[PDB]
Design an enzyme around this catalytic site. Structure first.
Site, PDB file in Angstrom:
ATOM      1  N   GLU A   1     -28.596   3.133   0.652  1.00  0.00           N
ATOM      2  CA  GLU A   1     -27.690   2.245  -0.081  1.00  0.00           C
ATOM      3  C   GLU A   1     -26.330   2.154   0.604  1.00  0.00           C
ATOM      4  OE1 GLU A   1     -28.446   0.242  -2.308  1.00  0.00           O
ATOM      5  OE2 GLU A   1     -30.025   0.998  -3.578  1.00  0.00           O
TER       6      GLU A   1
ATOM      7  N   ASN B   1     -24.532  -8.897  -3.798  1.00  0.00           N
ATOM      8  CA  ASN B   1     -25.934  -9.098  -4.136  1.00  0.00           C
ATOM      9  C   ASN B   1     -26.220 -10.590  -4.185  1.00  0.00           C
ATOM     10  OD1 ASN B   1     -26.676  -6.320  -4.714  1.00  0.00           O
ATOM     11  ND2 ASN B   1     -25.276  -6.515  -6.466  1.00  0.00           N
TER      12      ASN B   1
ATOM     13  N   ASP C   1     -27.468 -12.284  -6.633  1.00  0.00           N
ATOM     14  CA  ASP C   1     -27.039 -12.905  -7.874  1.00  0.00           C
ATOM     15  C   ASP C   1     -25.547 -13.095  -7.980  1.00  0.00           C
ATOM     16  OD1 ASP C   1     -26.145 -10.352  -8.477  1.00  0.00           O
ATOM     17  OD2 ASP C   1     -27.395 -10.106 -10.262  1.00  0.00           O
TER      18      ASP C   1
ATOM     19  N   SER D   1     -23.241 -10.740  -8.059  1.00  0.00           N
ATOM     20  CA  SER D   1     -22.605  -9.459  -8.337  1.00  0.00           C
ATOM     21  C   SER D   1     -22.418  -8.711  -7.026  1.00  0.00           C
ATOM     22  CB  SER D   1     -23.446  -8.624  -9.311  1.00  0.00           C
ATOM     23  OG  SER D   1     -24.679  -8.215  -8.744  1.00  0.00           O
TER      24      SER D   1
ATOM     25  N   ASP E   1     -22.347  -4.555  -5.307  1.00  0.00           N
ATOM     26  CA  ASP E   1     -22.705  -3.145  -5.416  1.00  0.00           C
ATOM     27  C   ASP E   1     -21.618  -2.292  -4.783  1.00  0.00           C
ATOM     28  OD1 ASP E   1     -25.196  -3.782  -6.472  1.00  0.00           O
ATOM     29  OD2 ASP E   1     -26.332  -3.129  -4.725  1.00  0.00           O
TER      30      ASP E   1
ATOM     31  N   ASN F   1     -24.017  -1.720  -9.454  1.00  0.00           N
ATOM     32  CA  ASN F   1     -23.690  -3.140  -9.474  1.00  0.00           C
ATOM     33  C   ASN F   1     -22.771  -3.536 -10.626  1.00  0.00           C
ATOM     34  OD1 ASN F   1     -25.143  -4.859 -11.697  1.00  0.00           O
ATOM     35  ND2 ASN F   1     -26.688  -3.406 -10.972  1.00  0.00           N
TER      36      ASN F   1
ATOM     37  N   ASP G   1     -32.294   3.807 -17.729  1.00  0.00           N
ATOM     38  CA  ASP G   1     -32.420   2.453 -18.287  1.00  0.00           C
ATOM     39  C   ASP G   1     -33.851   2.019 -18.561  1.00  0.00           C
ATOM     40  OD1 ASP G   1     -33.542   1.334 -15.895  1.00  0.00           O
ATOM     41  OD2 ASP G   1     -31.749   0.165 -15.419  1.00  0.00           O
TER      42      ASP G   1
END
Ligand code: CL
Ligand code: CL
Length: 129
Positions: free
Chosen positions: A35, A46, A48, A50, A52, A59, A101
């Site tokens: 990462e 990202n 979308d 957003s 990170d 995110n 989650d």
């Protein structure tokens, strides 16, 4: 801060990630390698829209607030910039929420694609823990 591999392993162990929700320390070190390359300052947009942040690439759509992500839920109740500190406390506390989650460490697509099903114990070889 760019952590050494075992330096990050020791910090994650101290903060209680070792075997957290059944994920061994090698899983967390493997994920951080891919990462962020162990760099607390890492940031990456990202698809979308957003972004990170930090050692575990947390995110801004669900977990931290960066001021520029529509739909931000800020479930870790933290500015995303706090995830870039040399002290990993905020990233670890938030990662513990992420891994809870429902999807476990599959929440990190890099873990699923580069660590899952591999010899992740290799990431803590040589570490004095
Ligand atoms: Cl980009
Ligand atoms: Cl899978």
């Amino acid at each position: 801060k760019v952590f050494g591999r075992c330096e990050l392993a020791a910090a994650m162990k101290r903060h209680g990630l070792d075997n957290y929700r059944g994920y061994s320390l090698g899983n967390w070190v493997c994920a951080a390698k891919f990462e962020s390359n162990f760099n607390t300052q890492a940031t990456n947009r990202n698809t979308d829209g957003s972004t990170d942040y930090g050692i575990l690439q947390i995110n801004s759509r669900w977990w931290c607030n960066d001021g520029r992500t529509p739909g931000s839920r800020n479930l870790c109740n933290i500015p995303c910039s706090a995830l870039l500190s040399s002290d990993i406390t905020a990233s670890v506390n938030c990662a513990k929420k992420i891994v809870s989650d429902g999807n476990g460490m599959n929440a990190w697509v890099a873990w699923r694609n580069r660590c899952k099903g591999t010899d992740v114990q290799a990431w803590i070889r040589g570490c004095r823990l």
